[PDB]
Design a protein around this ligand. Sequence first.
Ligand SMILES: CCCCCCCCCCCCCCCCC[C@@H](O)O[C@H](CO[C@H](O)CCCCCCCCCCCCCCC)COP(=O)(O)OCC[N+](C)(C)C
Ligand SMILES: CCCCCCCCCCCCCCCCC[C@@H](O)O[C@H](CO[C@H](O)CCCCCCCCCCCCCCC)COP(=O)(O)OCC[N+](C)(C)C
Ligand SMILES: CCCCCCCCCCCCCCCCC[C@@H](O)O[C@H](CO[C@H](O)CCCCCCCCCCCCCCC)COP(=O)(O)OCC[N+](C)(C)C
Ligand SMILES: CCCCCCCC/C=C\CCCCCCCC(=O)O[C@H](COC(=O)CCCCCCC/C=C/CCCCCCCC)COP(=O)(O)OCCN
Ligand SMILES: CCCCCCCC/C=C\CCCCCCCC(=O)O[C@H](COC(=O)CCCCCCC/C=C/CCCCCCCC)COP(=O)(O)OCCN
Lengths: 175, 70, 105, 98, 318, 113, 114, 347, 83, 115
Amino acid sequence: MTMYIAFILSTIFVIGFVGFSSKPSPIYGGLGLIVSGGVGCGIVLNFGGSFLGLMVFLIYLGGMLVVFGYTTAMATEMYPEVWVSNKTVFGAFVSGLMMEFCMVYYALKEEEVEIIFKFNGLGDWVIYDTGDSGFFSEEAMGIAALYSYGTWLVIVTGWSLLIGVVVIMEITRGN
Amino acid sequence: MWFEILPGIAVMAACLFIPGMATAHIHKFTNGGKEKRVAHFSYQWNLMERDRRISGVNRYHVTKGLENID
Amino acid sequence: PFFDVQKRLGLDLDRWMTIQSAEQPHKIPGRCHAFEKEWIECAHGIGGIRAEKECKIEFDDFVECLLRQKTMKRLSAIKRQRDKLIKEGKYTPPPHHLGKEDPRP
Amino acid sequence: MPLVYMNIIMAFAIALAGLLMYRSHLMSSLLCLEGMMLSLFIMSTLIILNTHFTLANMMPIILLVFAACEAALGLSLLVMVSNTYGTDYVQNLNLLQC
Amino acid sequence: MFMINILSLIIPILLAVAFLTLVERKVLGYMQLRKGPNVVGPYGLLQPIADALKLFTKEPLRPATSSISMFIIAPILALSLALTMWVPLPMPYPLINMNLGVLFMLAMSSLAVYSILWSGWASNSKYALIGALRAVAQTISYEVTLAIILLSVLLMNGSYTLSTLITTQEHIWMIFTSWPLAMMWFISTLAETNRAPFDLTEGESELVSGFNVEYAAGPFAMFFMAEYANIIMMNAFTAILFLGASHDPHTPELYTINFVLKTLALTITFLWIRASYPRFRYDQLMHLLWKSFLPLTLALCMWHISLPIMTASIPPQS
Amino acid sequence: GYSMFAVGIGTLLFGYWSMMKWNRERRRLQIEDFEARIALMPLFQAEKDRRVLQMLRENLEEEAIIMKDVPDWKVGESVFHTTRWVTPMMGELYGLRTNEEILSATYGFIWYT
Amino acid sequence: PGIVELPTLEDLKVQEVKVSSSVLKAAAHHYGAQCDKPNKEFMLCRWEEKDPRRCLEEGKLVNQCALDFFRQIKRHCAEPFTEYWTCIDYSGLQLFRHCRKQQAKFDECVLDKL
Amino acid sequence: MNPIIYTTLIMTVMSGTMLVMISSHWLLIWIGFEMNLLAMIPVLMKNFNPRATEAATKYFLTQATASMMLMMAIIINLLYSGQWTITKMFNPVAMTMMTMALAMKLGLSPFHFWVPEVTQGISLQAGLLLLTWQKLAPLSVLCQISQSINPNLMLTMAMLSILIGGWGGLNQTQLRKIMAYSSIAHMGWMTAVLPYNTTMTILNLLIYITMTLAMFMLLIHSSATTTLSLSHTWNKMPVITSLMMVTLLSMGGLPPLSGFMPKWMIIQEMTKNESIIMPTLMAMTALLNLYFYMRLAYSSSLTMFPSTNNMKMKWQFEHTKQMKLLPTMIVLSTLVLPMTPALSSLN
Amino acid sequence: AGRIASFLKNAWAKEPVLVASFAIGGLAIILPSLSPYTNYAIRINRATPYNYPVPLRDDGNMPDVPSHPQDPQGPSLEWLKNL
Amino acid sequence: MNIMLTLLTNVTLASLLVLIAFWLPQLNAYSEKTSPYECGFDPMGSARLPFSMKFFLVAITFLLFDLEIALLLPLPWASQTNNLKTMLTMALFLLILLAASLAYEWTQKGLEWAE
Ligand SMILES: CCCCCCCCCCCCCCCCC[C@@H](O)O[C@H](CO[C@H](O)CCCCCCCCCCCCCCC)COP(=O)(O)OCC[N+](C)(C)C
Ligand SMILES: CCCCCCCCCCCCCCCCC[C@@H](O)O[C@H](CO[C@H](O)CCCCCCCCCCCCCCC)COP(=O)(O)OCC[N+](C)(C)C
Ligand SMILES: CCCCCCCCCCCCCCCCC[C@@H](O)O[C@H](CO[C@H](O)CCCCCCCCCCCCCCC)COP(=O)(O)OCC[N+](C)(C)C
Ligand SMILES: CCCCCCCC/C=C\CCCCCCCC(=O)O[C@H](COC(=O)CCCCCCC/C=C/CCCCCCCC)COP(=O)(O)OCCN
Ligand SMILES: CCCCCCCC/C=C\CCCCCCCC(=O)O[C@H](COC(=O)CCCCCCC/C=C/CCCCCCCC)COP(=O)(O)OCCN
């Protein structure tokens, strides 16, 4: 397990997930989700998915911004909660951290199956492919191929987006 | 002045000159004086790795010409 | 339930993406293209019940190409035996596994 | 399975458990749902990149799209709930019983 | 040796920001029939040093109702992102060569907004909250149009690599091909950097000081440096994108000089614009971006998708 | 009124024509570069084959060296039922080697900027 | 499930081509015009057998033909070739466009000598 | 809501169901579910009615969670086998995610808590659509993975659905909650035979759809939403009360009415697989559904409840709007038992 | 001719941005189908050699396949060099 | 590796700057100096009260529109396909639907803020 970079980034990913999963003020939940989105971008970049990581990071920094806008208006509280300002939020945060730590310790020192199967470790570098060819990016062409190959996907996605705009208009009508 | 704004703009230009010029100078210095190689795709990286392996000194920029064919 | 309008009309709405052995752009192959090709050709028309039993060898090869669990176990065994031999000092790994190999093109 | 896969899967499990538990705010549960989409995106992207499934490189993008609409949908509902009660508390959604 | 390059990229940008503050005051003074700073040092050259020393030797205030952690984090994030903006820019050789430089810069620019959001929220002040919500509105107004503008202009480049832009514009400037987009792009940058007539998040005529009203001394200084560094970086990005200088592989100094001159011209253009127009309303900016810029941007995106196919002029890179 | 629109359209047309010429030339240059790569490929393929085979052979010889007295261990045993060639995993290649070249092989291209 | 056969280290020895990527890119067009037959033989075997172990001899022939090509260049004229591949090497992208004058000189020398 | 927008949303819901039912790719099936839910949410809120907003919110939350589990099952199945086709569904843990997500989408116990609330909070037409058309996609998905379904999980969920529907229906005076609990019981009946014969599942689904269409159309005709409101119908439309009583008898499963046809055949199937205790338990448990159908029959048709004076004015007016398919739905929901062998056309 | 002309004049007076946007969009939709250079673009895209051309095994009756790259047979890019 | 070093150096410089800002000057903080600023008078409520947002619908529309740039981004790479007509048709179709969504929300008064 060389430089532990992928493992460290995954651990930070889970830590941010625990952070926004304990349900504190939507402000800090958004902060934790931004952190997890950034580290997930890093994880994907380490595997060769530069466009997908940037795209996910780019998509999240926008949706979270809208959420920040909605939280200031409707999710506001006179006293907003942080991870140490409340008993149950701190309890959930500590429980998540300890579950992370115990699963990591058991899977690293031992080889135990949690739900599906077990693991050995030795780093994520082993699963690589040593593929040596190309004046292009395989990910770029795969993503690029949607227009040429995924005509049906483009059709259903565009219809879904237009329908979603209509749905938002109709739902927020009120009266 | 109206030409007394010029000293500040000149100081700005002097400060902004340093990044690019220093980057170019460091790229030449570190890669043997020939414009550090760009590897956007895996083929170029493989070329760099082959050059590093055949250089005999573990530096990719050290180039071996016709004097290695005996 | 499943109304196979694609097969009836010969349309191919979403069958191009179901497997990794099916006409990738620029002819880029999957990492386990051969194994999936063999598994699919083994079990083409015999049916699911017969496929699950008679083409199990090709499927096992395909899955172990996908996940490499057996290779990981073998490499871990090699590594642990080498480590226990080194800790008591009887292996002395060769220079080319220590970064001293005379490189070749 | 590498440790990265288990970390992503347990992140999804944590987000799902966070959604299935409500403290007071609907916005927090919406954030948990969006976190579940993020974890699914990361997991599928890693699986596709590892196996070099070229044509599947587009499915995470599609995934993100159908996150947004869903997320958008949720946000819309929230404002209506707020307009009825002045707060996004799930306690006020109790007019209908079993 | 990479640390020397990082420092050589960081320190000169901070000095250039410090002296851009001086240039702006002088440009505004002489455009308003006065002089500007000319007492502290010869021609006011020592004014930025005095301002920085006064700012960092003055006590910083901790608001009693503020959330201290996010309050401290926000200026650090703003300044660090402002400094990180510069690493993929080719001058003519980037510090970090990325296959996706435009996307990286766009995502990090998206990231920059939170510093303002968390500054407004963490201060626990009403005016700070108003400034933060104006920032939310501004970002919602500008990101979509800015992104499609980049996509449309880069359709003629062939990729998102910033070093390919020099090759694309080897014979002509991009502004001669997409001047209708450039105009909009220019305005979009004015919104992205919170500059007049879109200085709404820090509107002094209404919000006293906006999002950073509760900030003082060092944190305020860091916000101010982040603002001006972002100004310079966006003008450099505009110069590289639309005004392509020629590059000599044996003499990059000429390219560096020409690019710096163009960047300075665009920065002086912002300073000139600030002294010429009144300020918008934050709903008027949204209506301008959505009802005027968005339709033209979509039409020009369609046009720039179709044009290389109609003329058989598709760029090389896959 | 009309004059400004006319000069704008004229500049747009001139820029379009110039970029059309330049982009066609750029496509030709890219084709030439691709042809050079294609002409060079077979040599690189041969060297890659020999390098992979050599590294596998050294790995096998050491694997024999370490595995002296393990009871039921077969030296060089495969994990696949099939007897056809399977591309090495790159964990099979640099497994018994130093960490620096493991990083170079795994993250060398990604981390190079 | 079976022992995987591997060639001995004596079977993998060959006279290597130890010129850098700049030299190869500078000589690539003439190398592909001259050494076409053994390279096509090797690549046809490579795509037909799908196994590197089957035709290492084709790779040995590839190296021998490439070495003969480079030896012929070295014996006939190396000054234009060196002036060409040095300029090719200077560029960070190794652009053919960067210097057509040295390429023209090299082409003239090879046309008038071979 | 504008009528054009309403028709567009209805067509989008139906297109989502069709995309689920025609796709061979798991991603496309998930996309169909997503688009179906997206277009369904506004339909539950045609009238503002903050109760309808609550119902839409609860429906959206449950369906979003079910979709999350669906996508995780698909991703895990892809991880353990590089397949995208709807097939044997190799991984078992991914299969349990599949089963839980599809059960939550169907409303199978113990993921049924939403159904009574969502049905009560919306109008009768929305409830009709929710309780008839929204069961097609999950059942179609289940019918293709039936060989890989663990019989234990599916059978215990079906038995729990039957028990909980029967028990919860006994306490209800609101007709929409009665319809929801009947829906839960019939979903349990359909899923109890799915691991053995999908033809019987399709048969039961068709019969259930006909009966529920007839009952919802009768409830729309006599604009009643509670038991006491329906007790006034005899003084205005006795024919509606008689037809509703016969339809309730058919739903109870009494022969020779057509509601007896599915259960019978389901039993007829499950004994062939040496299953005796479960069919007996399900048959004995359906008597709760029969009891709370007969209570409604007593309150609505077999006895005359007191009326009001203003009802006299209602005597002078007709039902202007017409349901064309109502007579056919009634006849199919009652008198089609002698045509039982026609189910051979289903497979 | 007399109604749409007045409507267009009023739209140009009131909403020039929308008129320009719709004109550009309509042109971008229509002209690509009416252009003789689209086929040239497709041919240029096809002519780019991204991957290795694997040689075909000679059976003895392939007159249209060259034996050498410089042989007269095979596709020609002389249409591209003068474009 | 180089990008991580760059980020670490930038964050370290910012943190050193804030540390110098908070530890160099003399601090005299009392109750009234650290109070919130509302132009000279004491604030009535708290800044943590609900703040009505009049562009929520435009915010949701921005959420939906930001996921079409994601779709639109791989267009430079999609322009290199051999099926140029199909790619052009699909790109134009997607942009036409985006424009139709914008037009529909415009005509339905969705771009106007709440009063
Ligand atoms: C209570 C009565 C219920 C009646 C239901 C509605 C009555 C009207 C009939 C509706 C017509 C729709 C289908 C008929 C023509 C369409 C042709 C084609 O689409 O159908 C073919 C086959 O036709 C239909 O499958 C059967 C239609 C017959 C419906 C009547 C059966 C009712 C059950 C018996 C009770 C007695 C009813 C008496 C009615 C008066 C397709 O075969 P296939 O794609 O391979 O099967 C898909 C299912 N898989 C997944 C198992 C493979
Ligand atoms: C720009 C980026 C690059 C910068 C590079 C340098 C990094 C700078 C680091 C930032 C801090 C520098 C600020 C300059 C003054 C330091 C302030 C502090 O450290 O001094 C005192 C530290 O003294 C404390 O009382 C601690 C004393 C003992 C407690 C633990 C120390 C144990 C260390 C062992 C010392 C033994 C001898 C060491 C030498 C061999 C705190 O005094 P305090 O009143 O709070 O705050 C007001 C300070 N005033 C007076 C200047 C206005
Ligand atoms: C039976 C009634 C039909 C009409 C009902 C419409 C409702 C269904 C929605 C649309 C159904 C039509 C099916 C089209 C699927 C696309 C696949 C097929 O058409 O072929 C493609 C052809 O696509 C063409 O672009 C034409 C289809 C594009 C249609 C334009 C817009 C249609 C949208 C209309 C309905 C959508 C919702 C409403 C929108 C307002 C691929 O061509 P090609 O590139 O050779 O092959 C690529 C694969 N390679 C690379 C291996 C070679
Ligand atoms: C032959 C085929 C060609 C294909 C088509 C190409 C032809 C296109 C012809 C038209 C192009 C014009 C588009 C240019 C940008 C659009 C401008 C616009 O329409 O917006 C203005 C608004 O513009 C502004 O208000 C700008 C305000 C901010 C001003 C800031 C300073 C002014 C500019 C300074 C110089 C800018 C320099 C630009 C280039 C810089 C270098 C990159 C209209 O707004 P309103 O009048 O309010 O209408 C709405 C109510 N009905
Ligand atoms: C299917 C074709 C697609 C290709 C073109 C599309 C490209 C992108 C353009 C569409 C973007 C969205 C357009 C949204 C349109 C909504 C218009 C609207 O509702 O606004 C009206 C006003 O708009 C109008 O005036 C009606 C439409 C005006 C004309 C629109 C175009 C008509 C045809 C022009 C082009 C014809 C063909 C080109 C010929 C050009 C000559 C060479 C109300 O104004 P308010 O701002 O709400 O308030 C004002 C009062 N306070």
